[PDB]
Design a protein around this ligand. Structure first.
Ligand SMILES: [K+]
Ligand SMILES: [K+]
Ligand SMILES: [K+]
Ligand SMILES: [K+]
Ligand SMILES: [K+]
Ligand SMILES: [K+]
Ligand SMILES: [K+]
Ligand SMILES: [K+]
Ligand SMILES: [K+]
Ligand SMILES: [K+]
Ligand SMILES: [K+]
Ligand SMILES: [K+]
Ligand SMILES: [Mg+2]
Ligand SMILES: [Mg+2]
Ligand SMILES: [Mg+2]
Ligand SMILES: [Mg+2]
Ligand SMILES: [Mg+2]
Ligand SMILES: [Mg+2]
Ligand SMILES: [Mg+2]
Ligand SMILES: [Mg+2]
Ligand SMILES: [Mg+2]
Ligand SMILES: [Mg+2]
Ligand SMILES: [Mg+2]
Ligand SMILES: [Mg+2]
Ligand SMILES: [Mg+2]
Ligand SMILES: [Mg+2]
Ligand SMILES: [Mg+2]
Ligand SMILES: [Mg+2]
Ligand SMILES: [Mg+2]
Ligand SMILES: [Mg+2]
Ligand SMILES: [Mg+2]
Ligand SMILES: [Mg+2]
Ligand SMILES: [Mg+2]
Ligand SMILES: [Mg+2]
Ligand SMILES: [Mg+2]
Ligand SMILES: [Mg+2]
Ligand SMILES: [Mg+2]
Ligand SMILES: [Mg+2]
Ligand SMILES: [Mg+2]
Ligand SMILES: [Mg+2]
Ligand SMILES: [Mg+2]
Ligand SMILES: [Mg+2]
Ligand SMILES: [Mg+2]
Ligand code: NA
Ligand SMILES: [Zn+2]
Lengths: 121, 114, 204, 123, 56
RNA sequence: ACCGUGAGGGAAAGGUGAAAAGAACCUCGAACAGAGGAGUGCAAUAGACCCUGAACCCGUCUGCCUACAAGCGGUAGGAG
RNA sequence: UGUAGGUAUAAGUAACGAUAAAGGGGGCGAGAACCCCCCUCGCCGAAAGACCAAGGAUUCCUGAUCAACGCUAAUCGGAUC
RNA sequence: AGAGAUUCGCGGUUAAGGAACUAGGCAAAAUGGUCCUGUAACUUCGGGAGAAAGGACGCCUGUCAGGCCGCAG
RNA sequence: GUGGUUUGGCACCUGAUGUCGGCUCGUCACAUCCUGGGGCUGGAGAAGGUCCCAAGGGUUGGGCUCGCCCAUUAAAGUGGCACGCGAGCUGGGUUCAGAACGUCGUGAGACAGUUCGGUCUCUAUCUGUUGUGGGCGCAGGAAAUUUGCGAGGGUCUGACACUGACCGUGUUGGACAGACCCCUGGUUUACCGGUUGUACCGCCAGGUGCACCGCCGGGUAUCCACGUCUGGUAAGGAUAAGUGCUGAAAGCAUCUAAGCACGAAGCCGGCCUCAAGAUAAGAUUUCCAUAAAGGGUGGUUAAAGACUAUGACCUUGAUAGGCUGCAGGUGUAUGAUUGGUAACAAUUAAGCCGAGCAGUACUAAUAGCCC
């Protein structure tokens, strides 16, 4: 459950470390974003000598969330942090690596390229 | 008569499983659908909570992958559970181990029973 | 058309393709035809049905005579239904096999009663101001109820505090999961209004 | 709402209510019949009969568990002696409540609660 | 907050229409022969439902 | 009297009966609390707050009207 | 927006003045939630315990009384004699 | 004395988020004890300073070491 | 020419008609922001421009204080209602007493100015509105099941795929609303456990009181949303703007005057709830006076409830409690063996609770009195 002014961990190898959620996309008065949802973010901190600069506005897709998520098979999954991966203008990954696990929900949302992660759960 | 009990018996699903408690370390084999070829995935971790009534119970298993804690809630009656194995028995002093979230490394260990 | 029924409770089942479903169990039970109404005598066509067997200790003499005319044992709950696809005589039995071919049903019941409730719970009013920042005593207050001296009145239909719940509610298009004629049981997907033990009308 | 909430608060805080119920239980055990308001007696009937059921197992454990409710040595002695001897072989329903009238000062509905085995005219 | 007019005697009496004193529920003692409150111990003789309850 | 530290300010309140002859005694009631009698007296609905005993205001009884009806409440018609 | 006295209306309504708390058994009595005795419970305890002074002026003790006073009743009282 | 509607007074807990509230972090939350380390710019050389920032804390046994219990000393 | 929403003119109402913006709650209009239907185009398609018909429903969150900016959305419309709404809120702004700067004045002081600080009273009588009862009537007395004169609600919309498109197609979300607690998540001063200080039960053990429920960890039923199901949809009929057929007046023409086809989220319906005090008081079945024909008062109570009202049961009774078993909460009590020098650990196996379910007359539910 991510909303405006939430803070997320950036889970790729682009220089961004943390992001602040500006907007949840996909409708008037849409409050919460879950795994697989597209959001607009602002970059809050970067590692030294990074491609993207601190303060840039980008798009991202949520890959980990602390609030538990229900699957149609009656099971649930939750993580210890809220983490997202940055996207360029076209909608491709800005980076080359993914750190930590990724929800299995990312498969149907045209993020099979994200699904090349250390573990899909 | 017991209509709810009759309904539960009529729709009973899943398989028998070995006894386990909170604090035990288990491995669950879960059937997943990777496009078309159905696969089996292994999830190993510590049971931190069991709740529910009878055969409609749910149990929560916690593991740590890449320094990120993951929790999964499974129904006991789930037809997607192929097998449950109890790797080790843990000794604890409470029903729900919610204190394990704020722990890592050797501070999150659980003493084995025997 | 339809029958009477009693809500038992809720459970969860797994469908054939491994989907967890929340189910409501309804004891539909045998309903007997207590009266037949006609266009030529009443002004419309309907079947009156009685549901739960009653002893003579709890049946008034007018009701007892009404049942004796139809040659049935006294019942506790009666209700009318319309548009039956067939002919049904006085004093005959209908069971939950009536719903065997049905895919979706409508359930009519009486919701649980909340008593007197304020505008926040009854109507989702936002509340006046914040919990702090100068709040005195209007945290759960309605606010303004009118527009000064030009109407100089409160309009009819203004949303206010009052009794909430304990009223007739319909839920439509509940999918039927299973029919058990050996136990007079009907399984539907979802929730029906009312508490356990309340009487329902199940429409095909 | 109070749907399926099954004890009377009796216009008191929790500690005061528990202390009053314990005192009333001790008074009923010592003097086999006491006079009180109807609502208090109906609460006491809920409170005190599981305490009398504990005397069907004369053990140190049951004595200590009963003392946890009572905290009264004389009440405990009388209860595990003569009261227990009298209420052996009765499967519950050890008490009886009979209404009597109203008080002058507040028009409170009055009654008395007694142990059924110490009244002789009521068989 | 304030009455614009004083109320007339008629208006006051119309409101007081529903002020009444409740009649007690009295039963007769078939044996003793006196009045007592129904579902209550008859205080004259101490009997209740044919059995002695309060011993004088 | 009361009010004010003080200088000071500053009320309300008359009438049994000619004569106390001011009601022994009885009944209800825990009690004169009060009343109903008896007795005194021209009179007690003169009984102690007592001559006379108005209005506003408050009751009971009797007669007529009144639960499909809408504004200064009356006025002029008019059945029962 | 006149003065004194009496009586209304709002109305059997607001309120009965710290959320430290009460329960039972006996006594007296025409009458008891509240008065007296006993048991249990709770509150204060650098006080809400014990003293000096200012100020008050019989409120102190006992017997009768429950009209008025006591924000209820009272057989009780710092109330009346 | 009952009863345990709305609403108000005084309090308690709260998933995910964490000032997005608001004129304003108002109110609340948080910090907080003893001992040991270690403390910047600036300065009127006294200060700033308890700056900041870290660590230990229960019970048992033995001349600080070993052991034991709990989510938490 | 229209309007009265800007700046004005007039001075007719006012022993107080008492305040800008924001919040809350709305309601109305259309001069239409989006969605729906059309005429024209200097309209090839694709989007655009302009005009007509149309007001049903919708019409975001922030950094700043009319307007600018950031990110979205189908869209982020314009106005009226004492510039809607302070006996509903706030008090940032504004009329007050303190103080300071600039400017003006000899001075007291003043200002198209600026700046820091600065009490928002009232127990709802009538009417209005939301709920809920008593009486009588219909009706000689009743128990039920109903028809619907009418009233209210509901009506939103995106993306994608197949055939730079017409049309047709399906697969799915966002928001909003209703119900519900199997699931997830909250509460849970019922309940269970750990632990600090202190007091008491000679001592100890075991408890208990108090310290915010002392603190801490859990937590069933109930109540809930952050959860789960369900819904909005088409157009049945008459139509608006427009498109046509046959056709005189006016031998030609003409969508029209007699006629006939279509054609909108708009109107009346379908759907949901209320509804015969609808005094036009409707209909159908059955029973009719006294015991339990119908009730009242009463009792045991409830998933019903402010009081009422309503539901179940009242002894040939499972209504509530207790009792006996379970589902379940908590987590291994007291003691005894067993090891340790101890703090402690293992077995015996737990104990306590059980608002839920099942069984059982032990307790309480007296047909007494009144229509
Ligand atoms: K008006
Ligand atoms: K209980
Ligand atoms: K005279
Ligand atoms: K004279
Ligand atoms: K007079
Ligand atoms: K007249
Ligand atoms: K005046
Ligand atoms: K005395
Ligand atoms: K205004
Ligand atoms: K309608
Ligand atoms: K539940
Ligand atoms: K619960
Ligand atoms: Mg209710
Ligand atoms: Mg709020
Ligand atoms: Mg204030
Ligand atoms: Mg307040
Ligand atoms: Mg209370
Ligand atoms: Mg306490
Ligand atoms: Mg009244
Ligand atoms: Mg007297
Ligand atoms: Mg005279
Ligand atoms: Mg006179
Ligand atoms: Mg009429
Ligand atoms: Mg009439
Ligand atoms: Mg005046
Ligand atoms: Mg009033
Ligand atoms: Mg006052
Ligand atoms: Mg009051
Ligand atoms: Mg002196
Ligand atoms: Mg004295
Ligand atoms: Mg008095
Ligand atoms: Mg004295
Ligand atoms: Mg929270
Ligand atoms: Mg949290
Ligand atoms: Mg802000
Ligand atoms: Mg804001
Ligand atoms: Mg502060
Ligand atoms: Mg003039
Ligand atoms: Mg005036
Ligand atoms: Mg106003
Ligand atoms: Mg000044
Ligand atoms: Mg200040
Ligand atoms: Mg849960
Ligand atoms: Na139970
Ligand atoms: Zn008798």
């Amino acid at each position: 459950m991510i909303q405006q002014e939430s803070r997320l961990v950036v889970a790729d190898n682009s220089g961004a470390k943390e992001a602040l959620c500006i907007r949840v996309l996909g409708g008037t008065r849409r409050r919460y974003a879950s795994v697989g949802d597209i959001i607009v973010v602002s970059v809050k901190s970067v590692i030294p000598s990074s491609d993207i600069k601190k303060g840039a506005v980008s798009k991202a897709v949520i890959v980990r969330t602390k609030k538990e998520v229900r699957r149609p098979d009656g099971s649930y999954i939750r993580f210890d942090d809220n983490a997202c991966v940055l996207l360029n203008a076209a909608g491709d990954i800005r980076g080359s690596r993914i750190f930590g696990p990724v929800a299995r929900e990312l498969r149907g949302t045209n993020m099979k390229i994200v699904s090349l992660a250390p573990e899909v759960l | 008569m017991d209509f709810i009990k009759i309904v539960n018996e009529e729709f009973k699903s899943g398989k028998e499983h070995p006894k386990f408690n909170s604090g035990d370390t288990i491995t669950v084999e879960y059937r997943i659908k990777e496009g078309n070829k159905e696969r089996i995935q292994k999830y190993r971790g510590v049971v931190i909570r069991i709740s529910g009534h009878g055969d409609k119970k749910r149990f929560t298993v916690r593991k740590i992958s890449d320094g990120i804690g993951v929790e999964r809630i499974f129904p006991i009656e789930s037809p997607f559970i192929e097998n449950i194995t109890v790797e080790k028995y843990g000794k604890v002093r409470r029903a729900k181990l919610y204190y394990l979230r704020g722990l890592t490394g050797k501070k999150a260990r659980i003493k084995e029973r025997r | 058309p339809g029958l009477l029924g009693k809500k038992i409770g809720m459970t969860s089942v797994f469908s054939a393709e491994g989907k967890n479903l929340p189910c409501t169990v309804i004891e539909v039970g045998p309903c007997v035809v207590t009266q037949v109404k006609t266009l030529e005598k009443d002004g419309y066509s309907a079947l009156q049905l009685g549901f739960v067997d009653a002893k003579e200790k709890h049946t008034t003499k007018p009701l007892a005579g009404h049942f004796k005319k139809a040659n049935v044992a006294p019942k506790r709950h009666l209700a009318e239904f319309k548009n039956f696809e067939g002919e049904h005589k006085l004093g005959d039995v209908l069971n939950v096999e009536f719903f065997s071919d049905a895919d979706f049903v409508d359930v009519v019941g009486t919701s649980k009663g909340k008593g007197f409730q304020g505008v926040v719970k009854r109507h989702g009013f936002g509340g006046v101001g914040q919990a702090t920042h100068g709040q005195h005593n209007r945290l759960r207050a309605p606010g303004a109820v009118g527009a000064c001296s030009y109407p100089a009145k409160v309009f009819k239909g203004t949303r206010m505090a009052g009794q909430m719940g304990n009223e007739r509610v319909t839920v439509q298009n509940l999918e039927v999961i299973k029919v058990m004629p050996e136990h007079n049981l009907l399984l539907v997907k979802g929730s029906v209004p009312g508490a356990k033990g309340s009487i329902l009308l199940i429409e095909k | 709402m109070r749907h399926n909430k099954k004890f009377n608060h009796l216009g008191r805080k929790a500690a005061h209510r528990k202390a009053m119920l314990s005192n009333m239980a001790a008074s009923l055990i010592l003097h086999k019949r006491i006079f009180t308001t109807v609502a208090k007696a109906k609460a006491l009937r809920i409170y005190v009969e599981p305490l009398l059921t504990k005397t069907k197992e004369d053990t140190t454990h049951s004595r200590r568990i009963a003392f946890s409710y009572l905290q009264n040595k004389y009440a405990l002695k009388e209860l595990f002696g003569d009261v227990a001897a009298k209420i052996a072989d009765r499967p519950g329903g050890y008490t009886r409540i009979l209404k009597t009238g109203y008080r002058l000062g507040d028009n409170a509905a009055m009654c008395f609660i007694e142990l059924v085995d110490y009244n002789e005219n009521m068989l | 907050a304030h009455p614009k007019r004083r109320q007339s005697k008629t208006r006051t009496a119309k409101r007081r229409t529903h002020d009444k004193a409740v009649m007690p529920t009295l039963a007769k003692c078939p044996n003793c022969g006196a009045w007592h409150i129904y579902h209550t111990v008859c205080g004259d003789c101490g009997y209740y439902r044919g059995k002695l309850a309060i011993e004088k």
